[PDB]
PDB file of C-alpha atoms in Angstrom:
ATOM      1  CA  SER A   1      21.088 -16.536   5.989  1.00  0.00           C
ATOM      2  CA  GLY A   2      21.339 -13.018   7.309  1.00  0.00           C
ATOM      3  CA  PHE A   3      19.133 -10.005   7.113  1.00  0.00           C
ATOM      4  CA  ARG A   4      19.316  -7.237   5.487  1.00  0.00           C
ATOM      5  CA  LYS A   5      17.828  -3.345   3.847  1.00  0.00           C
ATOM      6  CA  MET A   6      17.942  -4.853   0.537  1.00  0.00           C
ATOM      7  CA  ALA A   7      16.109  -2.811  -2.091  1.00  0.00           C
ATOM      8  CA  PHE A   8      14.419  -4.366  -5.737  1.00  0.00           C
ATOM      9  CA  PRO A   9      16.197  -4.858  -8.411  1.00  0.00           C
ATOM     10  CA  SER A  10      15.725  -1.779 -10.592  1.00  0.00           C
ATOM     11  CA  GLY A  11      16.748  -1.969 -13.981  1.00  0.00           C
ATOM     12  CA  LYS A  12      13.314  -1.841 -14.514  1.00  0.00           C
ATOM     13  CA  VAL A  13      12.756   1.629 -13.631  1.00  0.00           C
ATOM     14  CA  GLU A  14      16.451   2.749 -15.348  1.00  0.00           C
ATOM     15  CA  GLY A  15      15.072   2.370 -18.299  1.00  0.00           C
ATOM     16  CA  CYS A  16      12.331   4.896 -17.607  1.00  0.00           C
ATOM     17  CA  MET A  17      14.272   7.945 -16.390  1.00  0.00           C
ATOM     18  CA  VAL A  18      14.419  10.822 -18.520  1.00  0.00           C
ATOM     19  CA  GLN A  19      15.062  14.030 -17.891  1.00  0.00           C
ATOM     20  CA  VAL A  20      12.972  17.556 -18.110  1.00  0.00           C
ATOM     21  CA  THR A  21      14.212  21.588 -18.895  1.00  0.00           C
ATOM     22  CA  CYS A  22      11.667  24.280 -18.759  1.00  0.00           C
ATOM     23  CA  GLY A  23      13.919  27.439 -18.751  1.00  0.00           C
ATOM     24  CA  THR A  24      16.728  27.135 -16.682  1.00  0.00           C
ATOM     25  CA  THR A  25      15.280  24.891 -14.317  1.00  0.00           C
ATOM     26  CA  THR A  26      16.418  20.509 -14.969  1.00  0.00           C
ATOM     27  CA  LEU A  27      15.085  17.496 -12.995  1.00  0.00           C
ATOM     28  CA  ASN A  28      13.973  14.046 -13.503  1.00  0.00           C
ATOM     29  CA  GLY A  29      11.197  13.034 -15.063  1.00  0.00           C
ATOM     30  CA  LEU A  30       9.313   9.312 -15.289  1.00  0.00           C
ATOM     31  CA  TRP A  31       8.695   7.971 -19.225  1.00  0.00           C
ATOM     32  CA  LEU A  32       6.099   5.661 -19.628  1.00  0.00           C
ATOM     33  CA  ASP A  33       4.269   4.585 -22.477  1.00  0.00           C
ATOM     34  CA  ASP A  34       3.939   8.543 -24.501  1.00  0.00           C
ATOM     35  CA  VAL A  35       3.784  10.675 -21.143  1.00  0.00           C
ATOM     36  CA  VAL A  36       6.914  12.286 -19.267  1.00  0.00           C
ATOM     37  CA  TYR A  37       5.708  13.172 -15.825  1.00  0.00           C
ATOM     38  CA  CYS A  38       7.212  15.444 -13.354  1.00  0.00           C
ATOM     39  CA  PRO A  39       7.456  17.792 -11.051  1.00  0.00           C
ATOM     40  CA  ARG A  40       5.313  20.831 -11.715  1.00  0.00           C
ATOM     41  CA  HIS A  41       8.181  23.064 -10.000  1.00  0.00           C
ATOM     42  CA  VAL A  42      10.594  21.746 -13.156  1.00  0.00           C
ATOM     43  CA  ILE A  43       8.376  25.844 -13.974  1.00  0.00           C
ATOM     44  CA  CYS A  44       9.348  27.857 -11.514  1.00  0.00           C
ATOM     45  CA  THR A  45      13.028  29.903 -10.599  1.00  0.00           C
ATOM     46  CA  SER A  46      14.410  30.148  -7.454  1.00  0.00           C
ATOM     47  CA  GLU A  47      12.438  32.922  -7.054  1.00  0.00           C
ATOM     48  CA  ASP A  48       9.268  31.626  -7.492  1.00  0.00           C
ATOM     49  CA  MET A  49       9.612  28.992  -4.891  1.00  0.00           C
ATOM     50  CA  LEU A  50       8.998  31.412  -2.163  1.00  0.00           C
ATOM     51  CA  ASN A  51       5.381  31.997  -3.125  1.00  0.00           C
ATOM     52  CA  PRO A  52       4.751  30.621  -6.568  1.00  0.00           C
ATOM     53  CA  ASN A  53       1.208  30.549  -8.341  1.00  0.00           C
ATOM     54  CA  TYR A  54       1.533  27.551 -11.101  1.00  0.00           C
ATOM     55  CA  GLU A  55      -1.591  28.540 -12.681  1.00  0.00           C
ATOM     56  CA  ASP A  56      -0.151  31.338 -13.245  1.00  0.00           C
ATOM     57  CA  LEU A  57       3.421  30.623 -14.050  1.00  0.00           C
ATOM     58  CA  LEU A  58       1.713  27.883 -16.776  1.00  0.00           C
ATOM     59  CA  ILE A  59       0.459  30.260 -18.886  1.00  0.00           C
ATOM     60  CA  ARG A  60       3.570  31.291 -19.834  1.00  0.00           C
ATOM     61  CA  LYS A  61       5.064  27.575 -20.638  1.00  0.00           C
ATOM     62  CA  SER A  62       3.896  25.989 -24.344  1.00  0.00           C
ATOM     63  CA  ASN A  63       4.200  22.357 -25.426  1.00  0.00           C
ATOM     64  CA  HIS A  64       8.283  24.023 -26.374  1.00  0.00           C
ATOM     65  CA  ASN A  65       8.864  25.392 -23.622  1.00  0.00           C
ATOM     66  CA  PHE A  66       9.517  21.683 -21.998  1.00  0.00           C
ATOM     67  CA  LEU A  67      12.681  19.817 -22.927  1.00  0.00           C
ATOM     68  CA  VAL A  68      13.055  16.227 -23.107  1.00  0.00           C
ATOM     69  CA  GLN A  69      16.182  13.736 -22.977  1.00  0.00           C
ATOM     70  CA  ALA A  70      16.318  10.744 -22.757  1.00  0.00           C
ATOM     71  CA  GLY A  71      20.424   9.593 -23.628  1.00  0.00           C
ATOM     72  CA  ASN A  72      21.497  12.285 -26.008  1.00  0.00           C
ATOM     73  CA  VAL A  73      18.021  11.673 -28.146  1.00  0.00           C
ATOM     74  CA  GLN A  74      15.269  14.176 -27.343  1.00  0.00           C
ATOM     75  CA  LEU A  75      11.270  13.498 -27.243  1.00  0.00           C
ATOM     76  CA  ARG A  76       9.203  15.564 -29.162  1.00  0.00           C
ATOM     77  CA  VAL A  77       6.700  17.214 -26.786  1.00  0.00           C
ATOM     78  CA  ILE A  78       3.406  17.831 -27.741  1.00  0.00           C
ATOM     79  CA  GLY A  79       1.129  18.101 -24.555  1.00  0.00           C
ATOM     80  CA  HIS A  80       1.003  19.255 -21.487  1.00  0.00           C
ATOM     81  CA  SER A  81      -1.266  19.855 -18.313  1.00  0.00           C
ATOM     82  CA  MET A  82      -0.603  20.068 -14.765  1.00  0.00           C
ATOM     83  CA  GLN A  83      -2.211  16.875 -12.568  1.00  0.00           C
ATOM     84  CA  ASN A  84      -2.298  18.502  -8.811  1.00  0.00           C
ATOM     85  CA  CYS A  85       1.428  18.646  -8.638  1.00  0.00           C
ATOM     86  CA  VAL A  86       2.235  16.720 -11.564  1.00  0.00           C
ATOM     87  CA  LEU A  87       2.663  17.738 -15.300  1.00  0.00           C
ATOM     88  CA  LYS A  88       2.819  15.428 -17.784  1.00  0.00           C
ATOM     89  CA  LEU A  89       4.384  15.752 -20.771  1.00  0.00           C
ATOM     90  CA  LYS A  90       2.313  13.778 -23.548  1.00  0.00           C
ATOM     91  CA  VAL A  91       5.153  13.093 -26.037  1.00  0.00           C
ATOM     92  CA  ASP A  92       5.730  11.727 -29.954  1.00  0.00           C
ATOM     93  CA  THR A  93       7.024   8.398 -28.955  1.00  0.00           C
ATOM     94  CA  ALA A  94       5.863   5.457 -26.350  1.00  0.00           C
ATOM     95  CA  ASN A  95       8.772   4.608 -24.553  1.00  0.00           C
ATOM     96  CA  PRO A  96       9.811   1.118 -25.900  1.00  0.00           C
ATOM     97  CA  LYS A  97      11.344   0.282 -22.475  1.00  0.00           C
ATOM     98  CA  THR A  98       7.829   1.019 -20.188  1.00  0.00           C
ATOM     99  CA  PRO A  99       7.329  -2.433 -17.979  1.00  0.00           C
ATOM    100  CA  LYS A 100       4.260  -3.765 -16.724  1.00  0.00           C
ATOM    101  CA  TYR A 101       2.985  -0.618 -14.220  1.00  0.00           C
ATOM    102  CA  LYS A 102       0.380   0.911 -11.767  1.00  0.00           C
ATOM    103  CA  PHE A 103       0.936   3.440  -9.575  1.00  0.00           C
ATOM    104  CA  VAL A 104      -0.202   3.656  -5.755  1.00  0.00           C
ATOM    105  CA  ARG A 105      -1.198   5.359  -3.266  1.00  0.00           C
ATOM    106  CA  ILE A 106       0.332   3.823  -0.314  1.00  0.00           C
ATOM    107  CA  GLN A 107      -0.175   3.557   3.094  1.00  0.00           C
ATOM    108  CA  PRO A 108       2.131   4.821   6.790  1.00  0.00           C
ATOM    109  CA  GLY A 109       4.762   1.985   7.708  1.00  0.00           C
ATOM    110  CA  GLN A 110       5.073   0.538   3.937  1.00  0.00           C
ATOM    111  CA  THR A 111       8.419   0.437   2.610  1.00  0.00           C
ATOM    112  CA  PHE A 112       9.574   1.050  -1.122  1.00  0.00           C
ATOM    113  CA  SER A 113      13.358   1.264  -3.207  1.00  0.00           C
ATOM    114  CA  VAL A 114      14.048   4.917  -4.185  1.00  0.00           C
ATOM    115  CA  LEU A 115      16.001   5.384  -7.292  1.00  0.00           C
ATOM    116  CA  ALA A 116      17.700   8.501  -6.741  1.00  0.00           C
ATOM    117  CA  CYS A 117      18.358  10.335 -10.310  1.00  0.00           C
ATOM    118  CA  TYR A 118      20.945  13.029 -11.413  1.00  0.00           C
ATOM    119  CA  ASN A 119      19.812  14.820 -14.974  1.00  0.00           C
ATOM    120  CA  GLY A 120      18.050  12.527 -16.036  1.00  0.00           C
ATOM    121  CA  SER A 121      20.429   8.941 -15.303  1.00  0.00           C
ATOM    122  CA  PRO A 122      20.273   6.778 -12.158  1.00  0.00           C
ATOM    123  CA  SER A 123      22.760   7.198  -9.445  1.00  0.00           C
ATOM    124  CA  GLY A 124      21.692   4.279  -6.179  1.00  0.00           C
ATOM    125  CA  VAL A 125      19.129   2.471  -5.400  1.00  0.00           C
ATOM    126  CA  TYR A 126      17.393   2.361  -1.478  1.00  0.00           C
ATOM    127  CA  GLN A 127      15.061   1.696   1.174  1.00  0.00           C
ATOM    128  CA  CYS A 128      12.632   4.063   2.744  1.00  0.00           C
ATOM    129  CA  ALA A 129       9.347   3.804   4.620  1.00  0.00           C
ATOM    130  CA  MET A 130       6.750   6.196   4.505  1.00  0.00           C
ATOM    131  CA  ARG A 131       6.627   7.324   8.290  1.00  0.00           C
ATOM    132  CA  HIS A 132       3.846   7.571   9.817  1.00  0.00           C
ATOM    133  CA  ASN A 133       4.248  11.825   9.566  1.00  0.00           C
ATOM    134  CA  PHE A 134       4.220  11.302   5.732  1.00  0.00           C
ATOM    135  CA  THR A 135       7.850  12.079   5.235  1.00  0.00           C
ATOM    136  CA  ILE A 136      10.857   9.851   3.999  1.00  0.00           C
ATOM    137  CA  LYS A 137      14.476   9.975   5.303  1.00  0.00           C
ATOM    138  CA  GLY A 138      15.796   9.908   2.002  1.00  0.00           C
ATOM    139  CA  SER A 139      19.216  10.939   0.140  1.00  0.00           C
ATOM    140  CA  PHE A 140      18.143  13.733  -1.953  1.00  0.00           C
ATOM    141  CA  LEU A 141      20.210  16.188  -2.859  1.00  0.00           C
ATOM    142  CA  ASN A 142      20.221  19.427  -5.348  1.00  0.00           C
ATOM    143  CA  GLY A 143      19.161  18.079  -9.805  1.00  0.00           C
ATOM    144  CA  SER A 144      17.564  14.623  -7.391  1.00  0.00           C
ATOM    145  CA  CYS A 145      12.997  16.496  -7.483  1.00  0.00           C
ATOM    146  CA  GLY A 146      11.161  13.465 -10.447  1.00  0.00           C
ATOM    147  CA  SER A 147      13.118  10.474  -8.512  1.00  0.00           C
ATOM    148  CA  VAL A 148      10.789   7.695  -7.897  1.00  0.00           C
ATOM    149  CA  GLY A 149       9.631   5.392  -5.445  1.00  0.00           C
ATOM    150  CA  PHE A 150       7.996   1.462  -6.352  1.00  0.00           C
ATOM    151  CA  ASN A 151       7.617  -1.357  -5.651  1.00  0.00           C
ATOM    152  CA  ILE A 152       7.410  -4.486  -8.178  1.00  0.00           C
ATOM    153  CA  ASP A 153       5.537  -7.913  -8.266  1.00  0.00           C
ATOM    154  CA  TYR A 154       6.739 -10.251 -10.249  1.00  0.00           C
ATOM    155  CA  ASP A 155       6.426  -8.105 -13.932  1.00  0.00           C
ATOM    156  CA  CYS A 156       4.429  -4.625 -12.007  1.00  0.00           C
ATOM    157  CA  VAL A 157       6.075  -2.383 -10.964  1.00  0.00           C
ATOM    158  CA  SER A 158       4.144   0.371  -8.690  1.00  0.00           C
ATOM    159  CA  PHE A 159       5.362   3.708  -8.466  1.00  0.00           C
ATOM    160  CA  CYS A 160       4.200   4.863  -5.087  1.00  0.00           C
ATOM    161  CA  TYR A 161       6.707   8.104  -4.595  1.00  0.00           C
ATOM    162  CA  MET A 162       7.823  11.000  -7.158  1.00  0.00           C
ATOM    163  CA  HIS A 163      10.580  12.995  -4.906  1.00  0.00           C
ATOM    164  CA  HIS A 164      10.174  17.529  -4.629  1.00  0.00           C
ATOM    165  CA  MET A 165      10.309  18.537  -1.337  1.00  0.00           C
ATOM    166  CA  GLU A 166      13.341  18.690   1.735  1.00  0.00           C
ATOM    167  CA  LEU A 167      12.518  20.306   4.492  1.00  0.00           C
ATOM    168  CA  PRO A 168      14.100  22.312   6.874  1.00  0.00           C
ATOM    169  CA  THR A 169      14.769  19.353   9.229  1.00  0.00           C
ATOM    170  CA  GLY A 170      16.692  17.543   6.722  1.00  0.00           C
ATOM    171  CA  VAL A 171      13.666  15.075   5.863  1.00  0.00           C
ATOM    172  CA  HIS A 172      11.672  14.653   2.497  1.00  0.00           C
ATOM    173  CA  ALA A 173       8.433  14.929   1.226  1.00  0.00           C
ATOM    174  CA  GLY A 174       6.666  13.938  -2.282  1.00  0.00           C
ATOM    175  CA  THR A 175       3.502  13.207  -3.861  1.00  0.00           C
ATOM    176  CA  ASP A 176       2.479   9.711  -5.408  1.00  0.00           C
ATOM    177  CA  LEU A 177       2.533   9.419  -9.222  1.00  0.00           C
ATOM    178  CA  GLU A 178      -0.890  11.587  -9.667  1.00  0.00           C
ATOM    179  CA  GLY A 179       0.423  14.657  -8.018  1.00  0.00           C
ATOM    180  CA  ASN A 180      -0.882  14.182  -4.473  1.00  0.00           C
ATOM    181  CA  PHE A 181       1.670  15.616  -2.134  1.00  0.00           C
ATOM    182  CA  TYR A 182       1.091  12.575   0.918  1.00  0.00           C
ATOM    183  CA  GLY A 183       1.060  15.226   4.263  1.00  0.00           C
ATOM    184  CA  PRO A 184       0.733  17.798   4.770  1.00  0.00           C
ATOM    185  CA  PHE A 185       3.239  19.123   2.814  1.00  0.00           C
ATOM    186  CA  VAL A 186       2.816  21.818  -0.225  1.00  0.00           C
ATOM    187  CA  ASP A 187       5.375  22.270  -3.341  1.00  0.00           C
ATOM    188  CA  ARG A 188       6.554  25.805  -1.774  1.00  0.00           C
ATOM    189  CA  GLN A 189       9.583  27.264   0.093  1.00  0.00           C
ATOM    190  CA  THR A 190       7.812  27.930   3.165  1.00  0.00           C
ATOM    191  CA  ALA A 191       8.935  26.780   7.076  1.00  0.00           C
ATOM    192  CA  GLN A 192       7.066  23.434   6.800  1.00  0.00           C
ATOM    193  CA  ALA A 193       7.235  21.339  10.010  1.00  0.00           C
ATOM    194  CA  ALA A 194       7.124  17.760  10.802  1.00  0.00           C
ATOM    195  CA  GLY A 195       4.276  15.861  13.438  1.00  0.00           C
ATOM    196  CA  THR A 196       5.718  13.002  15.684  1.00  0.00           C
ATOM    197  CA  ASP A 197       8.105  10.559  13.984  1.00  0.00           C
ATOM    198  CA  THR A 198       6.342   7.004  15.623  1.00  0.00           C
ATOM    199  CA  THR A 199       7.818   4.376  15.037  1.00  0.00           C
ATOM    200  CA  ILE A 200       5.862   1.438  12.733  1.00  0.00           C
ATOM    201  CA  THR A 201       5.548  -0.928  16.201  1.00  0.00           C
ATOM    202  CA  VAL A 202       4.218  -3.486  13.484  1.00  0.00           C
ATOM    203  CA  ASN A 203       7.112  -3.452  11.982  1.00  0.00           C
ATOM    204  CA  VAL A 204       9.958  -3.794  14.233  1.00  0.00           C
ATOM    205  CA  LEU A 205       8.352  -7.046  15.604  1.00  0.00           C
ATOM    206  CA  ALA A 206       8.300  -8.452  11.783  1.00  0.00           C
ATOM    207  CA  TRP A 207      11.962  -7.806  12.236  1.00  0.00           C
ATOM    208  CA  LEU A 208      12.339  -9.123  15.522  1.00  0.00           C
ATOM    209  CA  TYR A 209      10.698 -12.293  13.827  1.00  0.00           C
ATOM    210  CA  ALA A 210      13.575 -12.301  10.934  1.00  0.00           C
ATOM    211  CA  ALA A 211      15.800 -12.011  13.766  1.00  0.00           C
ATOM    212  CA  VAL A 212      14.995 -15.470  15.737  1.00  0.00           C
ATOM    213  CA  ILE A 213      14.722 -17.059  11.943  1.00  0.00           C
ATOM    214  CA  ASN A 214      18.454 -15.241  12.135  1.00  0.00           C
ATOM    215  CA  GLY A 215      20.203 -17.014  15.892  1.00  0.00           C
ATOM    216  CA  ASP A 216      20.127 -13.754  17.292  1.00  0.00           C
ATOM    217  CA  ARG A 217      17.042 -15.348  20.219  1.00  0.00           C
ATOM    218  CA  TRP A 218      18.791 -12.838  23.348  1.00  0.00           C
ATOM    219  CA  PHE A 219      15.839 -10.658  23.144  1.00  0.00           C
ATOM    220  CA  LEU A 220      12.972 -13.864  23.750  1.00  0.00           C
ATOM    221  CA  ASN A 221      11.222 -13.635  27.624  1.00  0.00           C
ATOM    222  CA  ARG A 222       9.930 -15.683  29.337  1.00  0.00           C
ATOM    223  CA  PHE A 223       6.677 -12.932  29.431  1.00  0.00           C
ATOM    224  CA  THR A 224       3.468 -12.651  27.434  1.00  0.00           C
ATOM    225  CA  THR A 225       1.140  -9.223  27.450  1.00  0.00           C
ATOM    226  CA  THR A 226      -2.333  -7.719  25.727  1.00  0.00           C
ATOM    227  CA  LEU A 227      -2.615  -5.614  23.099  1.00  0.00           C
ATOM    228  CA  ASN A 228      -4.102  -2.726  25.797  1.00  0.00           C
ATOM    229  CA  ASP A 229      -0.704  -3.321  28.650  1.00  0.00           C
ATOM    230  CA  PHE A 230       0.904  -3.711  25.375  1.00  0.00           C
ATOM    231  CA  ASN A 231      -0.317  -0.378  23.853  1.00  0.00           C
ATOM    232  CA  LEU A 232       0.199   2.113  27.178  1.00  0.00           C
ATOM    233  CA  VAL A 233       4.258   1.068  27.203  1.00  0.00           C
ATOM    234  CA  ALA A 234       4.158   1.821  22.636  1.00  0.00           C
ATOM    235  CA  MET A 235       2.170   5.771  23.152  1.00  0.00           C
ATOM    236  CA  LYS A 236       4.885   6.398  26.047  1.00  0.00           C
ATOM    237  CA  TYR A 237       7.740   5.180  23.483  1.00  0.00           C
ATOM    238  CA  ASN A 238       5.664   7.220  20.257  1.00  0.00           C
ATOM    239  CA  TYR A 239       4.696   3.475  18.826  1.00  0.00           C
ATOM    240  CA  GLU A 240       1.717   2.804  16.641  1.00  0.00           C
ATOM    241  CA  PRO A 241      -0.776   1.219  18.565  1.00  0.00           C
ATOM    242  CA  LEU A 242      -1.501  -2.403  17.935  1.00  0.00           C
ATOM    243  CA  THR A 243      -3.932  -3.356  15.869  1.00  0.00           C
ATOM    244  CA  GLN A 244      -4.961  -6.767  15.751  1.00  0.00           C
ATOM    245  CA  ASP A 245      -5.092  -7.034  12.115  1.00  0.00           C
ATOM    246  CA  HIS A 246      -1.541  -6.101  12.817  1.00  0.00           C
ATOM    247  CA  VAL A 247      -1.246  -9.425  14.706  1.00  0.00           C
ATOM    248  CA  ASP A 248      -2.667 -10.413  11.504  1.00  0.00           C
ATOM    249  CA  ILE A 249      -0.713 -10.272   9.352  1.00  0.00           C
ATOM    250  CA  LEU A 250       2.308 -11.222  11.314  1.00  0.00           C
ATOM    251  CA  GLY A 251       0.332 -14.878  12.082  1.00  0.00           C
ATOM    252  CA  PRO A 252       3.012 -16.220   9.533  1.00  0.00           C
ATOM    253  CA  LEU A 253       5.873 -15.274  10.848  1.00  0.00           C
ATOM    254  CA  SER A 254       4.396 -16.418  14.487  1.00  0.00           C
ATOM    255  CA  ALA A 255       3.378 -19.975  12.656  1.00  0.00           C
ATOM    256  CA  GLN A 256       7.532 -20.174  11.020  1.00  0.00           C
ATOM    257  CA  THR A 257       9.136 -19.283  14.475  1.00  0.00           C
ATOM    258  CA  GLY A 258       6.782 -21.219  16.722  1.00  0.00           C
ATOM    259  CA  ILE A 259       7.000 -17.369  19.291  1.00  0.00           C
ATOM    260  CA  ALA A 260       3.169 -15.453  19.466  1.00  0.00           C
ATOM    261  CA  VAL A 261       2.658 -12.766  18.760  1.00  0.00           C
ATOM    262  CA  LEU A 262       1.888 -11.445  22.096  1.00  0.00           C
ATOM    263  CA  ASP A 263       5.023 -13.179  23.606  1.00  0.00           C
ATOM    264  CA  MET A 264       7.387 -11.013  20.458  1.00  0.00           C
ATOM    265  CA  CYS A 265       5.933  -7.672  22.120  1.00  0.00           C
ATOM    266  CA  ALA A 266       6.263  -9.165  25.427  1.00  0.00           C
ATOM    267  CA  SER A 267       9.737  -9.425  24.126  1.00  0.00           C
ATOM    268  CA  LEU A 268       8.953  -6.167  22.983  1.00  0.00           C
ATOM    269  CA  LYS A 269       8.576  -3.721  26.075  1.00  0.00           C
ATOM    270  CA  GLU A 270      11.401  -5.466  28.350  1.00  0.00           C
ATOM    271  CA  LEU A 271      13.785  -3.996  25.173  1.00  0.00           C
ATOM    272  CA  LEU A 272      11.759  -0.168  24.842  1.00  0.00           C
ATOM    273  CA  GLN A 273      11.635  -0.687  28.801  1.00  0.00           C
ATOM    274  CA  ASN A 274      15.493  -1.924  29.895  1.00  0.00           C
ATOM    275  CA  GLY A 275      17.556  -0.850  26.287  1.00  0.00           C
ATOM    276  CA  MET A 276      19.818  -3.404  24.476  1.00  0.00           C
ATOM    277  CA  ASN A 277      22.709  -3.082  27.495  1.00  0.00           C
ATOM    278  CA  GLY A 278      25.125  -2.513  24.085  1.00  0.00           C
ATOM    279  CA  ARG A 279      24.435  -5.236  22.132  1.00  0.00           C
ATOM    280  CA  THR A 280      23.346  -5.477  19.306  1.00  0.00           C
ATOM    281  CA  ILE A 281      20.616  -7.370  17.208  1.00  0.00           C
ATOM    282  CA  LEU A 282      20.747  -8.270  13.698  1.00  0.00           C
ATOM    283  CA  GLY A 283      23.873  -6.074  13.288  1.00  0.00           C
ATOM    284  CA  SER A 284      21.910  -2.617  14.564  1.00  0.00           C
ATOM    285  CA  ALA A 285      22.304  -1.446  18.508  1.00  0.00           C
ATOM    286  CA  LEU A 286      18.536  -0.302  17.923  1.00  0.00           C
ATOM    287  CA  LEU A 287      14.960  -1.232  17.232  1.00  0.00           C
ATOM    288  CA  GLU A 288      14.630  -1.116  13.287  1.00  0.00           C
ATOM    289  CA  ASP A 289      10.614  -0.087  11.709  1.00  0.00           C
ATOM    290  CA  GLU A 290      12.015  -0.181   8.009  1.00  0.00           C
ATOM    291  CA  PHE A 291      10.750  -3.726   7.332  1.00  0.00           C
ATOM    292  CA  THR A 292       7.270  -4.837   7.276  1.00  0.00           C
ATOM    293  CA  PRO A 293       5.922  -7.997   7.473  1.00  0.00           C
ATOM    294  CA  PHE A 294       5.913  -8.572   3.743  1.00  0.00           C
ATOM    295  CA  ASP A 295       9.723  -7.156   3.768  1.00  0.00           C
ATOM    296  CA  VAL A 296      10.617 -10.385   5.979  1.00  0.00           C
ATOM    297  CA  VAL A 297       8.394 -13.076   3.846  1.00  0.00           C
ATOM    298  CA  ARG A 298      10.771 -12.508   1.146  1.00  0.00           C
ATOM    299  CA  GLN A 299      14.565 -11.948   2.568  1.00  0.00           C
ATOM    300  CA  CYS A 300      13.727 -15.215   4.200  1.00  0.00           C
ATOM    301  CA  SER A 301      11.750 -17.492   0.900  1.00  0.00           C
ATOM    302  CA  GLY A 302      13.637 -15.614  -1.322  1.00  0.00           C
ATOM    303  CA  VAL A 303      10.992 -14.320  -3.776  1.00  0.00           C
ATOM    304  CA  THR A 304      12.394 -13.604  -7.096  1.00  0.00           C
ATOM    305  CA  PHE A 305      10.900 -10.868 -10.060  1.00  0.00           C
TER     306      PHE A 305
END
């Protein structure tokens, strides 16, 4: 047992990372089949980013202006097109290491693994969640644009995120693999503020279930509540209103622990109202909301891929 923030094994994605250079800008691209995907702002100078007209900047670009490098091997670019905020570079070689894959647009609250890369080469891997304000709290330095987020289902890699921007407040924004930004953000260097960072209530509850399974049970109280009563307390603490769908998703964990969802909800209410009194749960001194119910079942049943 024990409970840990855990990423998916990254080998299948590592073998899809390439380097993409256009003029004096270099970032990461994702090579699947005979297409390389990358952020369109690969065509921008630092001055262009203040106010780019991507359609116009792309006119000055041809196939050969895009250098794609996999290892010390150069791919030949035979076609290119802009789709929303991503460029698709068609290359003459299918990636032999292409895994089974899907593109998916995730919902706020869902989690995924990020493979942070620089110059096309993988640097590390960590877990993220799409916040309800459509940011993520990542680790992204210069050069990291085009790094991707993903989930793995046995043999299928589901890509859900490509990194594009860091807001002035240090959080991170980006697109799905069709180029559509999550949330209201745009690929321009302007003041963009995030909205309220609400806590992912259904995730906290799954984590509390995970603690109970792992022997941390001090927070369990003698009370129960109702969805409406709980949600009044949730609103005050900027927590996402809990729904019957959320209760249904927590059903398997309720069954394994013998603890009804509304009973766990009352324990969460008392932690929000009284604090943790300097104690810990699963080694954390705050309520963790970046584990999904799916995540908890996986790490409490040992699902492999």
